[model samples]
Target: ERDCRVSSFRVKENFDKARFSGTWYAMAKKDPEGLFLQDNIVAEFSVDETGQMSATAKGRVRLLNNWDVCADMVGTFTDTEDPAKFKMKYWGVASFLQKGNDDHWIVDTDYDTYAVQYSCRLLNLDGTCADSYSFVFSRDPNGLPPEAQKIVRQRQEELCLARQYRLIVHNGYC
Candidate 1:
């Protein structure tokens, strides 16, 4: 296996969007290269009748000079051959906010317990990820249980984001 290659990363098998449809709180995150949501990150996922998965995310973002603002973002995912991988196009509700496409992968999830999401925005010449972000999600906003955290920690290590992740505080900011 070509470990560390962006394309060589493993993902969840037979991921079910229906089961994943619900509210997820961001417990921790590994930010990408440029801009990112700061804290109070919560995401609501839904699957339409046509089996299209969509997400609405609420968070706070600090712009230049500490111009902090609460952001409402929406994302639509396009399915690929692999059930766990998707192409996501996301945009902020306001035109001034950021908009872009990204690779969305469910690295691991137990549906009711925890989930690990990963995205690689850029690739390096060595076939590794140049820019990548990851989110550790918990079904309960309070926090994940020790059992769930143990599994999540393993998944974070698999994504090479264990040390890079920072705790996401949800203090009713959003």
Candidate 2:
């Protein structure tokens, strides 16, 4: 049988608590088959006194006023030793967050370029398997030069493909 365990990729040592804080915006997300879309999504990450990472993300269709709020959902990093690996859960009106398990892995990262990929399985209202989705997030929140953004995007794409993630439409940002 083929081994199905996921492998860890190397990340730049520059990845740290301080640089990861604040907001990160999503650029382009693609699926396994190479279908891609640009996103107008933002995620905020913070480290608490207890040494845990928390996150809140919001997203909407690009250039559209229909914004979806993922306030009911929140997540924390499973491992603090490595700021790039984390898990998240949701609650309340966005109870759907409970059905799905989300995990993020930093495939490639740099001071001027960073990308985090996520895979999740969601449950439906009737307590049935709803859907599974995965995507890569690439950003340069500090306003890196255009060339840097391009490099980030390219690196993210390479990581996504190497991981064999099946990109799919997400309900919204979580």
Candidate 3:
């Protein structure tokens, strides 16, 4: 967990909100316990008139309770003191989705075709990350370009996430 601390890394300086607001397809992910999204995960990032980053994420998730027919989910993010970080409060629009707040950090992004994100949801007594995850998103729904792919791998190494990621397929089912 040495690599999962809030202060253990750096972020984009003066992050450009205009360039960042758009649809980001989750290509790879290291999910937390009971992860809501299984695949087809697409997150739309936008900036409200008040200048806050807002997000609505949806994907395929299993829910035993209520109308589980629709697996759509949604979430809202609040801005932090840092321009590159946010507090994400997510839930399933249906009764089945898990709800919680997490520290969302933008590890790095070209703001064109790729972005690397990190989150630490829980901490141990020793102040190390107990529950955490990282997401690799691509603007191109199919995948990343060669240059962006290289940067993505570099970011994974920088995050010390062991370079292990579960591929999230967007089959348009969600």
Candidate 4:
């Protein structure tokens, strides 16, 4: 186990709402120990026809995996302190079991860099309170180009960081 610090960093100034509403892929993640990795991950987000926002994520074992494990989440933005900072909610699929009783959050976002940090709370569930998660997303499904990806991977290796590993490849295309 590692000690993860929730940084008190402010959101970037330039945030675009339109750019945030599309398919994004998770490229790299910095864990508590400061390790990062190139990942084969995808997340789709859209404003529903009814005007609500929703997201779904699919990830696999490697860049060339044949299956994907998926997680569905829904969210909403309450307001924006700046173009980059806003409050939002991310409810797990099980949230559908009850109305207005799901996990919610206040997220600060960087639309240009596709980064976000959120403080989330699980409502209606006992023994749980606020927690935080950080995410780095890319508008490109496969993230940056191979060269850039390699650079990030090398840096992570140098840091000797541990990363989460998955086992399924969703589309069989890795």
Candidate 5:
């Protein structure tokens, strides 16, 4: 929001869906008002012959806003002219899970090691984000590499999301 749009908010160039397809761990995250995925978040990305990006995500959550358990969710991304931008429509397998249409942007990524991603759940009348989220993703669930961590931090600052990040706990339950 706020059209903070500038060259500095650059996305990965020549993004590769094949190289990107795989499991990514959300080592850290920033949640919005309607945030659903709690922790231990794992996302699997795939591509079809039609060049569509699809994903299945799982994470531990308090289902029905009460029952605690791991939940399975799925999503599909509609690609835009910009390789890094997508309209992601997602849903939960169970009616109790979360779902929505959001703007998914891969701010930057190495397509193998790490990725910095941002999603705005809603745009407000004043051109501000009603809600948004960010994930610092890594191919390794154990953790992010030192260099990759540095890049995520810098990108978060540049994107005006420095304070939005929160610890993403991975409980074995998930």
Candidate 6:
């Protein structure tokens, strides 16, 4: 058994959103309830002069069953006491797409290479996550190097999602 308590999780110390600005490829993801963003996921992060961070994410999502669409979603973060944690309010470009607010945590990152992100939408009475999702991101579309991969593996386990992630493909589908 591992420490899966949400409160016990560690995060990046003083995450710099400006330094993190740029495109990031979603190398892998652990899905949440009613999972979205099936594949070819790419996200662009930016920090404005006003000291606000936001992102535009594009990915292919399956709907109904057979139909798939490339979804363009936008998210803006609201700062919390923790430098690495924020509340992300997200919405899709299309009104028909899904929208909601969720916790956004920078579990870890080295701005030049890789980032591990986590979000717990709901919590269990026991203090563990009830509905959670995580994404392992790489600055390169090709993928992370062995060194970064090793670090990501460790972060995944820390997030309590060691075996739940599915590698996301990048085939220029979006």
Tell me, by TM-score, which candidate is best: 6
Total clashes, candidate 2? 2
- Model 6 CA deviation exceeding 4 Å by range: none
What does candidate 4's lDDT look like per residue over 1-174, in tens digits?
322322332344555456567776665554322211224556666665554455555443211344322334455655444555455654546543212322222133334334333333331233222332344455554445555545444433322232532221224344
What's the lDDT for all of these models? 0.92, 0.49, 0.80, 0.42, 0.83, 0.96
Ranking by lDDT: 6, 1, 5, 3, 2, 4
TM-score of each: 0.97, 0.56, 0.88, 0.47, 0.89, 0.98
Measured with C-alpha atoms, the lDDT of residue 48 in candidate 6 is 97
Candidate 1 lDDT, 47-80, residue by residue in tens? 9999999999999999888998999999999999
Ranking by TM-score: 6, 1, 5, 3, 2, 4
By lDDT, the better pick of 3 and 6 is: 6
Off by over 4 Å in 3: 1-4, 64-70
TM-score of 3: 0.88
Superposed model 5: Cα runs more than 4 Å off = 1-8, 63-65, 124-128
Best model number under lDDT: 6
Q: For candidate 5, lDDT tens digit of each residue in 28-70? A: 8988885677898999999999888999998888656487778
- The predictions' CA RMSDs to the true structure, in order, are 1.3, 8.2, 2.6, 8.7, 2.5, 0.7
lDDT of 4 at 39: 45
Worst 10 residues of 2 by lDDT: 30-39
Q: Which stretch of 10 consecutive residues in model 4 shows the poorest summed lDDT?
A: 97-106
Off by over 4 Å in 1: none
Report the candidate with higher lDDT, 3 versus 4: 3
Residue pair clashes in candidate 1: none
lDDT of candidate 3 over 1-174, digit per residue (tens): 246454677787777777899899999998876666677888898887888777788777655473334356666778788888888887777674577788888889989899999897887776556777989999989999998989888878777674667898877785
